[PDB]
Design a protein around this motif. Structure first.
Motif, PDB file in Angstrom:
ATOM      1  N   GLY A  77       1.815  -4.033  -7.195  1.00  0.00           N
ATOM      2  CA  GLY A  77       2.757  -4.404  -7.961  1.00  0.00           C
ATOM      3  C   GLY A  77       3.548  -2.731  -8.909  1.00  0.00           C
ATOM      4  O   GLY A  77       2.549  -2.173  -9.464  1.00  0.00           O
ATOM      5  N   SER A  78       4.786  -2.902  -9.552  1.00  0.00           N
ATOM      6  CA  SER A  78       5.010  -2.308  -9.997  1.00  0.00           C
ATOM      7  C   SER A  78       6.422  -1.870 -11.127  1.00  0.00           C
ATOM      8  O   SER A  78       6.905  -3.542 -10.732  1.00  0.00           O
ATOM      9  N   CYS A  79       6.645  -2.107 -11.269  1.00  0.00           N
ATOM     10  CA  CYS A  79       8.599  -1.558 -12.329  1.00  0.00           C
ATOM     11  C   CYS A  79       8.484  -0.091 -12.218  1.00  0.00           C
ATOM     12  O   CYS A  79       7.631   0.658 -12.976  1.00  0.00           O
ATOM     13  N   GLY A  95      -2.542  -0.526  -8.885  1.00  0.00           N
ATOM     14  CA  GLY A  95      -3.676  -0.107  -7.838  1.00  0.00           C
ATOM     15  C   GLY A  95      -4.831  -1.103  -8.065  1.00  0.00           C
ATOM     16  O   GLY A  95      -5.020  -1.083  -9.515  1.00  0.00           O
ATOM     17  N   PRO A  96      -5.458  -1.681  -7.496  1.00  0.00           N
ATOM     18  CA  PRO A  96      -6.390  -2.200  -7.484  1.00  0.00           C
ATOM     19  C   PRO A  96      -7.625  -1.747  -8.278  1.00  0.00           C
ATOM     20  O   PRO A  96      -8.071  -0.754  -8.350  1.00  0.00           O
ATOM     21  N   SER A 109      -0.828  -2.546  -0.240  1.00  0.00           N
ATOM     22  CA  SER A 109       1.134  -2.837  -1.818  1.00  0.00           C
ATOM     23  C   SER A 109       0.830  -2.312  -2.589  1.00  0.00           C
ATOM     24  O   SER A 109       2.191  -1.722  -2.583  1.00  0.00           O
ATOM     25  N   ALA A 110       0.234  -1.214  -3.435  1.00  0.00           N
ATOM     26  CA  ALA A 110       0.689  -0.559  -3.910  1.00  0.00           C
ATOM     27  C   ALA A 110       1.532   0.361  -3.221  1.00  0.00           C
ATOM     28  O   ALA A 110       1.989   0.647  -4.254  1.00  0.00           O
ATOM     29  N   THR A 144       0.705   5.003   4.560  1.00  0.00           N
ATOM     30  CA  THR A 144       1.578   3.878   3.861  1.00  0.00           C
ATOM     31  C   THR A 144       2.888   4.860   3.000  1.00  0.00           C
ATOM     32  O   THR A 144       3.933   3.901   3.317  1.00  0.00           O
ATOM     33  N   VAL A 145       2.878   5.879   2.393  1.00  0.00           N
ATOM     34  CA  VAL A 145       4.111   6.093   2.105  1.00  0.00           C
ATOM     35  C   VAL A 145       5.153   7.184   2.874  1.00  0.00           C
ATOM     36  O   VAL A 145       3.621   7.896   4.121  1.00  0.00           O
ATOM     37  N   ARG A 146       6.311   7.017   3.054  1.00  0.00           N
ATOM     38  CA  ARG A 146       7.098   7.307   3.794  1.00  0.00           C
ATOM     39  C   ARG A 146       8.009   8.741   3.182  1.00  0.00           C
ATOM     40  O   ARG A 146       8.226   9.441   4.486  1.00  0.00           O
TER      41      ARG A 146
END
Ligand SMILES: OC[C@H](Cc1cccs1)Nc1ncnc2[nH]ccc12
Ligand SMILES: [Cl-]
Length: 167
Positions: A77-79, A95-96, A109-110, A144-146
Motif C-alpha cells: 500500500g501507499s499514502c 514494498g515487501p 501491488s506496490a 506494472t507501471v504505465r
C-alpha cells in the motif's frame, strides 16, 4: 517535456539513472517523489532515512501524526504526504521486505500505486535493505507501471548491471 535530465530510456514510460534520489529531488523538485517506506512510516535507513534527513526530520514528524490518526499502512500500500523541501508530494510506498519474510508477490501491488500519478521520481521498490533482487524489481516496475517513472539508482555497480541485463 519535463526537467528530468540524463536518464536512459528503457521503455515508452520507464527511464533510469545512476543518482542519489535525495540530490535528484532537490534539483528537479518533482510533483511526486516516491519513498521506500515501511508500514509504520519509520524512516530510519535506506532511501527513507536519507529522504527524511534531507527534510530535517519534518517527514518523520508528519508521518508520526499520520500513523497516530490512521494506523499502519498495508504491505503493498501507499499514502500521499507532503514532499517538504524535496517535491510537491511524497508517495510513501511499502514494498515487501524480504528480510522480514514478506511475500515478494506484493511487489506488483506496490508498484500499482505509481499508476495514480502521471510522473514520478522513484527508487526500485524492495531493493537495497529491503532484500529483493533489484533486477526483478526493475522487471516488475516495467511490467506494472504505465505512467512516466524516472528511476534513481544509488549504487553504480548495480546501475550498470541493471542496464546491461535489461531485456
Ligand atoms: O532500491 C533502493 C536503493 C537500494 C540500494 C541498493 C544498493 C545501494 S542502495 N536505494 C537508494 N536508491 C536511490 N537513492 C537512494 N538514496 C539513498 C538510498 C537510495
Ligand atoms: Cl536501501
Amino acid at each position: 517535456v519535463n526537467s528530468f535530465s540524463g536518464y536512459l530510456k528503457l521503455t515508452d514510460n520507464v527511464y533510469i539513472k545512476n543518482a542519489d534520489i535525495v540530490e535528484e529531488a532537490k534539483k528537479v523538485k518533482p510533483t511526486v517523489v516516491v519513498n521506500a517506506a515501511n508500514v509504520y512510516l519509520k524512516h530510519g535507513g535506506g532511501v527513507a532515512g536519507a529522504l527524511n534527513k534531507a527534510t530535517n526530520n519534518a517527514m518523520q514528524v508528519e508521518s508520526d501524526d499520520y500513523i497516530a490518526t490512521n494506523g499502519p499502512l498495508k504491505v503493498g500500500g501507499s499514502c500521499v504526504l507532503s514532499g517538504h523541501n524535496l517535491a510537491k508530494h511524497c508517495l510513501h510506498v511499502v514494498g515487501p521486505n524480504v528480510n522480514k519474510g514478506e511475500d515478494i508477490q506484493l511487489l506488483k501491488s506496490a508498484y500499482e500505486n505509481f499508476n495514480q500519478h502521471e510522473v514520478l521520481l522513484a527508487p526500485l521498490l524492495s531493493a537495497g535493505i529491503f532484500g529483493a533482487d533489484p533486477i526483478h524489481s526493475l522487471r516488475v516496475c516495467v511490467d506494472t507501471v504505465r505512467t512516466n517513472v524516472y528511476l534513481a539508482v544509488f549504487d553504480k555497480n548495480l546501475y550498470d548491471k541493471l542496464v546491461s541485463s535489461f531485456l
